[model samples]
Target: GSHMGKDCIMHGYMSKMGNPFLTQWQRRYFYLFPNRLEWRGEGEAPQSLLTMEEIQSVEETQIKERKCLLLKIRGGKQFILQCDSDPELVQWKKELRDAYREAQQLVQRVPKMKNKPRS
Candidate 1:
């Protein structure tokens, strides 16, 4: 097969499951990449984020491909999460994956900003 120049970006709305705030934050912390932001919701159509099928597909893929997504609820606690057919990360996984986390805790915590100590 001939080498493809580059994968075309999908322009659609995405709906991320789990806590929206947490999902939004994790995208920045865990999945920090330059080209990543383009697929992000900032300048997106807002309809291609995450779907129920995409969410479960991720869980299924995590188990199949061993990808760690760090599932969260609201707190800082976490666990390895993934996406099998994530419309956003779909093209990403095809290229490469974030090293999987072997052992992780699936914690559902409250989302809040950590305060810095006085200097």
Candidate 2:
């Protein structure tokens, strides 16, 4: 068994797989891009919406390094979503642990036979 943490160390994903509200938003207001990197940016309140400073705040553990997106839907509740590609982050964490295990196994398998006498 892998001792993975509660995080996804590798890149993660979120899609309009379900949830009709969000799915409808994606189908109408947004375009689904199969590539994740294509959707990277600093989110801000649209001119028609409230500023980030106006949203309700929730106290969380201080983050040392973090990357996240700010998403707000007009006519609906505002939310500040946090995310990370760290294995310590829940969801995609097992991937990083598996990669680490594979790497360790490779290192263990490649024997140091460079100086061995071969016929």
Candidate 3:
């Protein structure tokens, strides 16, 4: 399930991914919403979405020659996104972690009940 939030926090171009064999680092546009982070490749099509709930952690690290922001999910899948600079990396990581916390808090709240169950 996906939900749109108030405003987009960060929007920038980042390397789509990082792999050993991949020589060229293709830059992709990334939209960081309050509840999710969405990215697209060459065209204006949806590439992928990583919800805040799915993100376990966000860290600033280097991906070979590029300064990257890494996102780790609970299920083991991770994304190494190359940002423009170190400051940008730090900003992305911090904002993402903040969003992660918000998502967690939202999930932790008790669900509302319509009515009492049959006795």
Going through the candidates in the order shown, the clash numbers are 20, 10, 0
Q: Which ten residues in a row have the lowest lDDT in candidate 2?
A: 27-36
By lDDT, rank the candidates, best first: 3, 1, 2
lDDT for each residue of candidate 1 in 1-119, tens digit (9 for 90 to 100): 69753333333333333443434322321231222322353544644322111111123235465544443322343334344345445543332232121111121242467555756
Which pairs clash in model 3? Answer: none
**TM-score for each of the candidates:** 0.22, 0.25, 0.67
TM-score of 2: 0.25
The residue-by-residue lDDT of candidate 2 on 23-101, one tens digit each, is 2322112211111112222344443221222222222234465543333333354433344333323332233233334
**Candidate 3 — number of clashing residue pairs?**
0
Compose the digit string of candidate 3's lDDT tens values, residues 19-94.
4444666678777778878877685644477667877777766547655567777667766666566666567667
Give the best candidate by lDDT: 3
Say which prediction, candidate 1 or candidate 2, comes out ahead on TM-score. Answer: 2
Deviation of model 3 at 4, angstroms = 15
Q: Which ten residues in a row have the lowest lDDT in candidate 1?
A: 98-107
- Sorted on TM-score, best first, the list reads 3, 2, 1
